[PDB]
């Protein structure tokens, strides 16, 4: 009576500590390469920003009118999205973006700012709605009738909630000094924003910029997190885009950047720009910048794990 | 898979088995115990390796609006370092696991051979190529008792001794 | 004669490469979980900052009067500590904090700044000592009698040592423009700080801030490291908190943030906010932000290492 | 711990031992050499693993005054990556060390069995369950010579041969 | 017939999982320690900057006159190099340095800026060539004859290529306010730089600095990356160092900092300040900041890998 | 390297060999197969470990003009963490590879001994110290057939049986 083991005609070559190319019976793959070219969001509150930029949801351009108080577990950014209608730029862009991606949505709240002796409905052609409008969450502060002195005002807002608030104001840099005097008046302007953790530091800078959206002026948006029971203050004398409402974070969420369609038929916790990585394997070779609960990215295209005995054919 | 020259392609019933040749005829069978042990250890190894973490990593870069070049180079540097670490860990992990798998199967085969030699004490000989030169006429029921681990070593002793 | 091995009634389950839950004879723990709720500082020069902030030791508020020239191997920050008496804020806070944590203490040195035609003892109610005082290391530079022109002065200091010096000045932002003219005079002010590695860039910004410590004004502290034989210079014309003394690093130290008591009976090289991790194990599961010579933090609560043979009971 | 069905709970003197049964009486003892070798290898393994580094890591965050959100997210991202790396390394380390420990003890037991078979050449038989069917009457002093590795295989040869 | 194995008189001690100091027959080293004290650049286009600073190649001080359009696969920085002739400083220094290290060289291009009613050849004594010169890539914009009003001009440049351009301008901070009025005129100056990704923010700050290179004034260089078909714009009214030519990246390269000689006889892909690490070993213990394709740095000085059987002598 | 007391310093021809002592004279030789297998496995291990990556890492710090202190402390912190990871991986890697190397050579020696016992079935005895008490007069050509694996176990059976 003889003893022996099984074998196959064509085995699978694997790598060991001593040799590279040892042919065994069976082997499985450990590095994932199959990618689903969709955003698997089955069972998740998903907000596709589309043409709306993530930061715009705080200021409210027209394309973000339906995202002023969104709520989601997964946030998708699109490359065609824009944060601004009037040509502008946020200070600390990626910080505020990373804050909003894991916010679970935003909840707006009227800050309660009243004005006296100053007209407050400044509009532009690039912020089109019914006609010439502006940011839905902001107030372009101007002068009474036209060229006049801007009364040096100061307005405060106390965070009357239990969670920190998102305060966003704006500094307008007109197309020329004469246009700054036309909108606010002559003289050096200044915008002071104060709290307990903040201390800044604003004065406009008029000049000619390249025509973006057909406009030569710019608007610099700024933000801070107001702690509970703490008060924010603004001492300004012209060139001020005041905040109408403040934002409050709802909870937790995931923020991704993608260019593929949304699919509620599949579920996945690992996302990248090209789709979703649905796999049980511990490693993947699709995208190194994949976010969520992903397999750890490796450079190897394939790593065959031996699941059987060494194959010794006759 | 050492002194055994090659495997049996016809053995489709299990990983290890018996191939006997007596006065009745030819026959092959599979040993369920050793095979089930090997596939249980390898299966448990797979279940230990087919693990995806529950740790969530947020988006730190920006594909649509590139971050500042300095912090971007720091982020790319760190991510590349971690990628090197996980590539090394994956390579060494797969290599070591394959080594221990092959040596594990070899250990199971050698243990089966050792216990089959333990059943036949002086009633059979060893040839050196994984067979047992059985010293008496062992019926198909006798070899069936060898596979079932019920071979009485003493009731066939003297008959297989004087040969 | 038979051969065999020992066994026990109740073994210890461990994990291997092939199976999870293999019962062996003996096993030890590799992940540390026991924490001492104290700061073990046996044999270490320890400075508990308490109500004094780490940065205040450079400017010298009242609560830091006994920390102007401290020396320690271990520095402990407390959450009740404050860097300022007059409401203010440092620029590059965490950079200077990380510099001071590993400094081994500070050594002050009179910079030798003399003034002519300017009164130099500006005080406030929030910096209480015997009466109304100010920062012990700073000089609030004002005008002669009251509203008057601030002479545009320039003062230089050459680092006459072998180690870099810590230069800290201040920019005062008063509660209003009229108060800035009351303290320094009308006209645009400017503060220039120059060296070989520095090039900045200062002009005040008056306005109304929220009353912190009963004060509406702010003071922005700034700092730089003056290399040996290199000179720092200041060209200012108002709103200047001049440095009296410069700081020099003593050597090396450790900086931690904690809320537990100090204990000189135990010794440890791994600290966190909740206490000290005294262990020989290679891994710990207490705090991922532990500093010093710590076991490497892991997510697993326990990882039993088999120290004995597999237990096969009868 | 293979063909030996189970361990001896009464063996409190060592890890491996001898349990004899002759015409004089019953008796159990411990083999100091194999046990001391096993506990020396495992002890050295522990001394190799009970290591805490001498590398000092400074405070990079701030629990009382949170740093900037961007650099804070980069720091949290890097720290979480390193935490994943050390969790994986700890898991795989403990698993591999336990595997090599169990297989090491099994190797020591099998080596003791092999050398005890080397002492008794044709003067005793093997049963298959870790015992030696000794072919002659071996006194308690004879088994004491077996444990002391002083058994003369030739002075009891012919007596244990014809049986 | 007996069986046995070979042995040697003096073996090599190695470390295992169970014991530390097991003597085996043969063993090899895995941690590299031998360093070549030269820069091995065999087969690589190498540019040794020497006394020229990496950033200077964009502005063009005298010491960088032969580096205005360099091209290399390996860039070497020297500690005696200087970015400036007139005492100045770049904003975001290390960002632009890291950009230029992997640029494969730079390609200059005339931006096409014409001026009317303004003299454009401002020189200094510290920028010595034939006599008093300036940066070869810049234009020190001044006034017509002497004290006069600087016409508020605006100049634009459209990136007419397929790769991003490097735009570098300068902001002059003179030794005093009266010298700023002497060079540009009285009144508040401003420099506006605009595009699609940029929005800044410049106004000078006159004052007295420490005499570096015999000069009390400073020049602050700034830069941005102009995307293809996108336009950059400048609205300035004084104190402006205009760009003559823009830079375009050639391709890819490696940037190192060293103090050893260049050697074209040896080849290496791992560089540090002390030389080149030429090794096949997976680990090294020379320099942790080594760049290129290096062995992974470890703290251990030596790690002997057993290449033979355990040595059991007689 | 267990029951064999020590190695042969005079064996300069290979890693394993035969040292015989018969009626003709003394002699030592080397077994090319087992030695070549061992040096092939260890050689392949070296070729698997003598690897330098193709991943390029750019300069993230600045030795001539120090970067900002905060980002510099973050960079130093990350680099120190990665250095700890690679130091641990190098230590554990070398230790495990040395262990598997020593146990591999021991396995090759034991396999050679096992196959030499497989050639001599009942024509020789085992002493316990790695020698074969050969029961018949084996000429130098007979031992040369043992080293060449051509020893006929049956043509010398009865002569070595009655002894
Ligand atoms: C071989 O491995 C694959 C890996 O998934 C598995 O699906 C398959 O059932 C295995 N087959 C055998 C015969 O083990
Ligand atoms: C906030 O302020 C309100 C009223 O001033 C007080 O009732 C509440 O306890 C405060 N909460 C905190 C957390 O300070
Ligand atoms: C980091 O790498 C990505 C490619 O994955 C590249 O697009 C990006 O520009 C890199 N970051 C920087 C700062 O260059
Ligand atoms: C079991 O392991 C623990 C771990 O510290 C040790 O203290 C104890 O002495 C060990 N006991 C035995 C019997 O090995
Ligand atoms: C510093 O300056 C003094 C006098 O100017 C000189 O003696 C000394 O050598 C200098 N040291 C250094 C390091 O430059
Ligand atoms: C990093 O994680 C800690 C919790 O350990 C958290 O308190 C902190 O806010 C996180 N950092 C940022 C920037 O959110
Ligand atoms: C011993 O190892 C070294 C390592 O490079 C090798 O060069 C040498 O040839 C080896 N010698 C033997 C006899 O294996
Ligand atoms: C750039 O502009 C030119 C002319 O305006 C046009 O022909 C070309 O297609 C444009 N390229 C891109 C990439 O926009
Ligand atoms: C980082 O470490 C280096 C030494 O390798 C040191 O020169 C440098 O100053 C450190 N970085 C900081 C920010 O201190």
From TrEMBL, chains B, D, F:
Belongs to the influenza viruses hemagglutinin family. Binds to sialic acid-containing receptors on the cell surface, bringing about the attachment of the virus particle to the cell. This attachment induces virion internalization either through clathrin-dependent endocytosis or through clathrin- and caveolin-independent pathway. Plays a major role in the determination of host range restriction and virulence. Class I viral fusion protein. Responsible for penetration of the virus into the cell cytoplasm by mediating the fusion of the membrane of the endocytosed virus particle with the endosomal membrane. It is found in: Host apical cell membrane; Virion membrane. Disulfide bonds join 138-142. It comes from the Viruses. Glycans are attached at residues 76, 148. This is Hemagglutinin. It comes from Influenza A virus (A/Shanghai/02/2013(H7N9)). Homotrimer of disulfide-linked HA1-HA2. Palmitoylated.
């Amino acid at each position: 009576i003889c003893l022996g083991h099984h074998a196959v005609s064509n085995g699978t070559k694997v790598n060991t500590l001593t040799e590279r190319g040892v042919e065994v019976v069976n082997a499985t793959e450990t590095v994932e390469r199959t990618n689903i070219p969709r955003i698997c969001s089955k069972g998740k509150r998903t907000v596709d920003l589309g043409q709306c930029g993530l930061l715009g949801t705080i200021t409210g351009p027209p394309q973000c009118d339906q995202f002023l108080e969104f709520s989601a577990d997964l946030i998708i950014e699109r490359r065609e999205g824009s944060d601004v209608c009037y040509p502008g730029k946020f200070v600390n862009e990626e910080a505020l973006r990373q804050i909003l991606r894991e916010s679970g949505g935003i909840d707006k709240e009227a800050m309660g700012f009243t004005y006296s002796g100053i007209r407050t409905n400044g509009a532009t052609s690039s912020c089109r709605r019914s006609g010439s409008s502006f940011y839905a969450e902001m107030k372009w502060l101007l002068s009474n009738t036209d060229n006049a002195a801007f009364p040096q005002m100061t307005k405060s807002y106390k965070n009357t909630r239990k969670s920190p608030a998102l305060i966003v104001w704006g500094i307008h840099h007109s197309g020329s000094t004469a246009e700054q005097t036309k909108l606010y008046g002559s003289g050096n302007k200044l915008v002071t924003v104060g709290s307990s953790n903040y201390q800044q530091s604003f004065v406009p800078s008029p000049g000619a910029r390249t025509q973006v959206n057909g406009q030569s002026g710019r608007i610099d948006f700024h933000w801070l997190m107001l702690n509970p029971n703490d008060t924010v203050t603004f001492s300004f004398n012209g060139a001020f885009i005041a905040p109408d409402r403040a934002s409050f974070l709802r909870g937790k969420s995931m923020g991704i950047q993608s260019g593929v369609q949304v699919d509620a038929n599949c579920e996945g916790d690992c996302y990248h720009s090209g789709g979703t990585i649905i796999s049980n394997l511990p490693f993947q070779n699709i995208d190194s910048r994949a976010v969520g609960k992903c397999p750890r990215y490796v450079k190897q295209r394939s790593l065959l794990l031996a699941t059987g005995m060494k194959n010794v054919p006759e | 898979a050492g002194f055994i020259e090659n495997g049996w392609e016809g053995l489709i019933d299990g990983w290890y088995g018996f191939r006997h040749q007596n006065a009745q005829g030819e026959g092959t069978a599979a040993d369920y115990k050793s095979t089930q042990s090997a596939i249980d250890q390898i299966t448990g190894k797979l279940n230990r390796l087919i693990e995806k973490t529950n740790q969530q990593f947020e988006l730190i870069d920006n594909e649509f609006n590139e971050v500042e070049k300095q912090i971007g180079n720091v982020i790319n540097w760190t991510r590349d370092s971690i990628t090197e670490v996980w590539s090394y860990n994956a390579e060494l992990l797969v290599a070591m696991e394959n080594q221990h798998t092959i040596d594990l199967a070899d250990s199971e085969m050698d243990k089966l051979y050792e216990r089959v030699k333990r059943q036949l004490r002086e009633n059979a000989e060893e040839d050196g190529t994984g067979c047992f030169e059985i010293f008496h006429k062992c019926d198909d029921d006798c070899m069936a008792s060898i596979r079932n681990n019920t071979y009485d070593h003493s009731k066939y002793r003297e008959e297989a001794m004087q040969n």
